[PDB]
Design an enzyme around this catalytic site. Sequence first.
Site, PDB file in Angstrom:
ATOM      1  N   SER A  96       8.590  -5.571   5.877  1.00  0.00           N
ATOM      2  CA  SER A  96       8.347  -6.694   6.784  1.00  0.00           C
ATOM      3  C   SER A  96       9.045  -7.906   6.192  1.00  0.00           C
ATOM      4  O   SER A  96       8.501  -8.564   5.303  1.00  0.00           O
ATOM      5  CB  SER A  96       6.852  -6.942   6.950  1.00  0.00           C
ATOM      6  OG  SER A  96       6.188  -5.817   7.524  1.00  0.00           O
ATOM      7  N   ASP A 121       6.178  -3.334  12.282  1.00  0.00           N
ATOM      8  CA  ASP A 121       4.759  -2.990  12.319  1.00  0.00           C
ATOM      9  C   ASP A 121       4.213  -2.824  13.742  1.00  0.00           C
ATOM     10  O   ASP A 121       3.286  -2.033  13.949  1.00  0.00           O
ATOM     11  CB  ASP A 121       3.942  -4.007  11.503  1.00  0.00           C
ATOM     12  CG  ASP A 121       4.142  -5.464  11.938  1.00  0.00           C
ATOM     13  OD1 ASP A 121       4.853  -5.753  12.919  1.00  0.00           O
ATOM     14  OD2 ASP A 121       3.563  -6.334  11.255  1.00  0.00           O
ATOM     15  N   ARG A 149       0.841  -1.185   0.000  1.00  0.00           N
ATOM     16  CA  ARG A 149       0.000   0.000   0.000  1.00  0.00           C
ATOM     17  C   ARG A 149       0.884   1.246   0.000  1.00  0.00           C
ATOM     18  O   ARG A 149       1.955   1.261   0.616  1.00  0.00           O
ATOM     19  CB  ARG A 149      -0.933  -0.019   1.219  1.00  0.00           C
ATOM     20  CG  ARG A 149      -1.696  -1.327   1.311  1.00  0.00           C
ATOM     21  CD  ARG A 149      -2.754  -1.390   2.396  1.00  0.00           C
ATOM     22  NE  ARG A 149      -2.247  -1.183   3.750  1.00  0.00           N
ATOM     23  CZ  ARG A 149      -2.708  -0.256   4.583  1.00  0.00           C
ATOM     24  NH1 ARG A 149      -3.710   0.526   4.210  1.00  0.00           N
ATOM     25  NH2 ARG A 149      -2.195  -0.135   5.801  1.00  0.00           N
TER      26      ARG A 149
HETATM   27  C1  LIG Z   1      -1.916  -6.401  12.015  1.00  0.00           C
HETATM   28  C2  LIG Z   1      -1.309  -7.711  11.740  1.00  0.00           C
HETATM   29  O1  LIG Z   1       0.048  -7.765  11.623  1.00  0.00           O
HETATM   30  C3  LIG Z   1       0.399  -9.063  11.380  1.00  0.00           C
HETATM   31  S1  LIG Z   1       2.074  -9.504  11.185  1.00  0.00           S
HETATM   32  O2  LIG Z   1       2.100 -10.957  11.144  1.00  0.00           O
HETATM   33  O3  LIG Z   1       2.467  -8.696  10.052  1.00  0.00           O
HETATM   34  N1  LIG Z   1       2.868  -8.890  12.573  1.00  0.00           N
HETATM   35  C4  LIG Z   1       3.177  -9.797  13.677  1.00  0.00           C
HETATM   36  C5  LIG Z   1       4.636 -10.191  13.631  1.00  0.00           C
HETATM   37  O4  LIG Z   1       4.838 -11.179  12.635  1.00  0.00           O
HETATM   38  C6  LIG Z   1       6.043 -11.836  12.991  1.00  0.00           C
HETATM   39  O5  LIG Z   1       6.005 -12.172  14.371  1.00  0.00           O
HETATM   40  C7  LIG Z   1       7.173 -10.862  12.724  1.00  0.00           C
HETATM   41  N2  LIG Z   1       8.465 -11.424  13.001  1.00  0.00           N
HETATM   42  C8  LIG Z   1       9.054 -12.283  12.115  1.00  0.00           C
HETATM   43  O6  LIG Z   1       8.488 -12.888  11.218  1.00  0.00           O
HETATM   44  C9  LIG Z   1      10.500 -12.465  12.293  1.00  0.00           C
HETATM   45  C10 LIG Z   1      11.372 -11.395  12.365  1.00  0.00           C
HETATM   46  C11 LIG Z   1      12.725 -11.616  12.525  1.00  0.00           C
HETATM   47  C12 LIG Z   1      13.183 -12.913  12.612  1.00  0.00           C
HETATM   48  C13 LIG Z   1      12.298 -13.972  12.536  1.00  0.00           C
HETATM   49 BR1  LIG Z   1      12.874 -15.777  12.648  1.00  0.00          BR
HETATM   50  C14 LIG Z   1      10.952 -13.756  12.376  1.00  0.00           C
HETATM   51  C15 LIG Z   1       6.984  -9.620  13.557  1.00  0.00           C
HETATM   52  O7  LIG Z   1       7.920  -8.673  13.101  1.00  0.00           O
HETATM   53  C16 LIG Z   1       5.598  -9.060  13.363  1.00  0.00           C
HETATM   54  O8  LIG Z   1       5.418  -8.044  14.335  1.00  0.00           O
HETATM   55  C17 LIG Z   1      -0.734  -9.844  11.331  1.00  0.00           C
HETATM   56  C18 LIG Z   1      -1.822  -8.973  11.563  1.00  0.00           C
HETATM   57  C19 LIG Z   1      -3.297  -9.402  11.616  1.00  0.00           C
HETATM   58  O9  LIG Z   1      -4.115  -8.468  11.889  1.00  0.00           O
HETATM   59  O10 LIG Z   1      -3.525 -10.633  11.405  1.00  0.00           O
END
Ligand SMILES: Cc1oc(S(=O)(=O)NC[C@H]2O[C@H](O)[C@H](NC(=O)c3cccc(Br)c3)[C@@H](O)[C@@H]2O)cc1C(=O)O
Length: 880
Positions: free
Chosen positions: A572, A626, A508
């Site tokens: 991300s 995020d 986006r």
């Molecule tokens: C609003 C919304 O956001 C999401 S999301 O999935 O984009 N955010 C949650 C987290 O996803 C993982 O935990 C990420 N870390 C990694 O993958 C990661 C990062 C570094 C090393 C390794 Br190994 C893994 C985090 O950085 C991130 O905060 C879903 C939704 C929803 O509404 O369903």
Amino acid sequence: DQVQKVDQYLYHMRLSDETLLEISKRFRKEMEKGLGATTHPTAAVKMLPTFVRSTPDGTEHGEFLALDLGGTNFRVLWVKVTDNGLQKVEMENQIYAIPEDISGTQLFDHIAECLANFMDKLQIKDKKLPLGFTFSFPCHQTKLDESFLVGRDVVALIRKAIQRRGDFDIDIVAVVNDTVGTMMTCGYDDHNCEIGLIVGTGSNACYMEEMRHIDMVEGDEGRMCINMEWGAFGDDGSLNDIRTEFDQEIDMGSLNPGKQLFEKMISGMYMGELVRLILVKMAKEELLFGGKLSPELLNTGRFETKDISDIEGEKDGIRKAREVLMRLGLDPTQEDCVATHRICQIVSTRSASLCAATLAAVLQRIKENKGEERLRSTIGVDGSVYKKHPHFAKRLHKTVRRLVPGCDVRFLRSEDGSGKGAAMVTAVAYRLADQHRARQKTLEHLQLSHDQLLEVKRRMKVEMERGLSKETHASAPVKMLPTYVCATPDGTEKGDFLALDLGGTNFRVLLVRVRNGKWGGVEMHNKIYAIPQEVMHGTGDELFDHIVQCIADFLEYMGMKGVSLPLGFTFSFPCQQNSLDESILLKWTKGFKASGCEGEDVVTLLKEAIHRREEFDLDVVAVVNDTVGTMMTCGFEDPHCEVGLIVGTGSNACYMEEMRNVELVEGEEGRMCVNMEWGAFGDNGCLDDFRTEFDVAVDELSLNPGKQRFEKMISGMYLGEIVRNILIDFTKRGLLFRGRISERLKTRGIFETKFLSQIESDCLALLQVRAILQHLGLESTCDDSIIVKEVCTVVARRAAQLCGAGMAAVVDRIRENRGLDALKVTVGVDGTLYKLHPHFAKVMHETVKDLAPKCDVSFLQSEDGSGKGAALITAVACRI
Ligand SMILES: Cc1oc(S(=O)(=O)NC[C@H]2O[C@H](O)[C@H](NC(=O)c3cccc(Br)c3)[C@@H](O)[C@@H]2O)cc1C(=O)O
Ligand SMILES: Cc1oc(S(=O)(=O)NC[C@H]2O[C@H](O)[C@H](NC(=O)c3cccc(Br)c3)[C@@H](O)[C@@H]2O)cc1C(=O)O
């Protein structure tokens, strides 16, 4: 030719399929009248709840006692049930007499004594066994153990009589109608049997029914067997266009005029009598016997149902009719015997057709209850008419199957009768109890005590401290990344900011406008673009050019084309971030093959692509995670918000930390936001004693085994995989779905977060849970819905409590930093699980209040991004 004369004479007794389907619809109305609350007291089909909640599944086992009381004789049975796979029941029984002398207390004293003799005679008196009762009529029954004979509860009487002996004692009791015992017996050999049927001297039938249709019993969940007492069908007149003058005559000459009218049409008691009345009348009209009559022809009961079965059974039934007529005192001709024989068929065929019509309505309702197009169903069948009348079972089977084309319907005759049936009810009652605590023993592994969460809180503490220090941060699973976001909002900020939110194939591009001062706020404009599959598999330099025009397009589409702006950036992907504006892509993810990226600064990648578009020249302030953006976003609503949280397809958290405690960054003065990456909590093994075999099974089958273990307990597709693995386990153990695993249940991914949320928020009859289970291609039975909804509730609760325990550390670790006691803090939260799940919010709030009593924590929803917080961190970066 006397056949046709009889046919035309008895024409109203030969029922067209049309009439039968009409009668079937009428019975359907009577079934609804007796089930409904306002209509039940005047309903002619009583539709009595039996309190039998389940049929047998074949694994029932134990030793059980029963009594069958018809009066003037009764049996006492011992029923031994083994789960060896053969479904072969073992019985002994004994008959005792009740003389005319045997007052209520005297009568049951006699009954308990016989039962005591029977148990002694049988070796078993030291055993305490369940006791079934069977009755050939209805009583007033409010629970499995109760009935009033209509003058007192017969269970209380037999129990108090046993207490006065002191010999033996008795376990749980069931009292069931004899149709119900028939169904239960047959359902132990055939587990498609949902209908008991008796066509005897009397006639009645029962079926399994869904609690949402039973008003007279509280609760909408599951099923209960209903004793229809259909003998009373038409007591109120509903059948009076089917019923003939012969039918009317029998009713006035009966012990019970105006009652059991449908029975009086179809059953064996009145069947032969109904043939006599036709002979008397045809003779009186000079159509048979030359008008002559005999004293015996005009005596009631002298023509017997047995005589009907004889006359249709023998290959020469005209000879056997000649003999029955002669014994009545007549002098029959050949025609007279032909006419008699045929009158016997018409009457017996009407009985078989009337059963078909009402069985049709029961079969149709079970079919609409289950809600598929095709129905396999088995009718447990007993009684002297259907067993010993030569042709009637055939006639019934053939007519039922015509009237319900949508059904494959087996018939199975019950031999041993109603003794084992009542016994089998208590056996199924034991089975339900055993399977309940069986699956509750597995679920207990997912229900954590308040002392256990505190321990989980503690280990979040140590893993946080461990990630911050420079010694373990390489070894620590929770990496505690510095964000280089060092400041939070004021009311100050004003301007326009672009946010570029890119992960996955669709970024986006957003324009954020900020109004400062009290009131004010933020509005959004985004546009979504796709990165074509070529662009992503090509070079990285053509990747960021594609990105940069989509910014040019939207900036123009805002009407702003040609203006330079500051820009926040949500990228991300795995990253080492060395500075607020600098971040290094480590591994591509999500499907991006673009070359010349990994090992490069993503901002220089973006910035050098901005230099080349000849107009463009925009300013890239910041790179953000995020959750950080989530925290910042409700910082504009609430200045007190130091913490972000995302519970979603993944889970992550961030707080503001004292720079003294962040050892990866030179200098101790001020605060810095920490992106925990707390989904990695537990990948060193620290949660291994809370991880069930189901958690372990989700872990081994994901993309990233051994990684992100805490994220897999608290969020994502992982919840529905936990659910599915439990459900599969129950089904292997015979505890769910009748022990048979769909290939569709082996399909990974089918339980999706949106479905866990609707399943859990559904109540009462659970129609929406069953609907989802049909949608997903699974067995939808009422009993199955309850269990599935339970497993979901347990799993989703652990996820919320675990999320609470870890979010409890964070608010104390903020507090021990400052040496404080009572803190009002606020958490911005985003993510789809937490917004859309019915109980997840409340449970976690409760969990945090419980394990961090000194902290006062508000949770304000944020959403919008994530990607939108990227521009709001820029507004606070454009601060200096
Ligand atoms: C609003 C919304 O956001 C999401 S999301 O999935 O984009 N955010 C949650 C987290 O996803 C993982 O935990 C990420 N870390 C990694 O993958 C990661 C990062 C570094 C090393 C390794 Br190994 C893994 C985090 O950085 C991130 O905060 C879903 C939704 C929803 O509404 O369903
Ligand atoms: C195996 C077998 O069982 C029998 S039976 O006649 O003893 N049982 C069948 C049904 O008969 C009646 O219709 C009963 N209702 C009443 O009396 C009744 C009484 C008052 C109000 C209402 Br409303 C119903 C039903 O409850 C019962 O199920 C015969 C045979 C055989 O082999 O000939």
